[PDB]
Amino acid sequence: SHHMKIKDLREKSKDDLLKTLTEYKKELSQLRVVQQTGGAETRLGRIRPIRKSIARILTVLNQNERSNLKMFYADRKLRCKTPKVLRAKLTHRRRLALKENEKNRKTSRQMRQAHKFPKRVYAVK
């Protein structure tokens, strides 16, 4: 029956997606009254296709909010006020670890000795 496919659901705006969310929370709420007052097994039984299509509208609304907010903090030099829900979640230990732009830092002498005496490729016969 009524079943929001997501391909025709990602082309909606933020206002029409909310207007069809109130449409489908309302249709679920007036099937919770037929689930308590008897209920034919055909009218009841549209409880999964509504409740999983509410889950499709909310995952289009939420994936369009993180997309339009990740492209609000990586745009410029505002990346110190980026909220931590939008940052790259790794292991806790991997965020504190030395990045590889760091950790290969070396002395002016340590650069010289790898330039004055570099490791040669060679063979033997």
Task: Note whether 22 binds another protein by CB under 8 A.
Answer: yes
Task: Note whether 125 binds RNA by CB under 7 A.
Answer: no
Beta-carbon count within 10 A of 6 CB? 12
Beta-carbon count within 10 A of 86 CB? 14
Beta-carbon count within 10 A of 50 CB? 19
Rounded distance, CA 66 to CA 57, Å?
15
Task: Note whether 28 binds another protein by CB under 8 A.
Answer: yes
Q: Which amino acid is at 18?
A: L
Number of shown-chain residues binding another protein (CB under 8 A): 46
Rounded distance, CA 71 to CA 44, Å?
42
Task: Note whether 40 binds another protein by CB under 8 A.
Answer: no
Identify the residue among 15, 22, 37, 93 touching RNA (CB under 7 A): 93
**Nearest Cα to Cα of residue 95 among 103, 87, 83:** 87
Contact residues for RNA, defined by CB under 7 A: 1, 3, 5, 7, 49, 59, 62-63, 66, 70, 77, 79-81, 84, 92-93, 95-96, 101, 104-116, 118-122
Contact residues: another protein, CB under 8 A: 14, 18, 21-22, 25-26, 28-30, 32-37, 58, 61-62, 65-66, 69, 81, 83, 85-86, 93, 96-98, 102-103, 105-107, 110, 113, 116-125
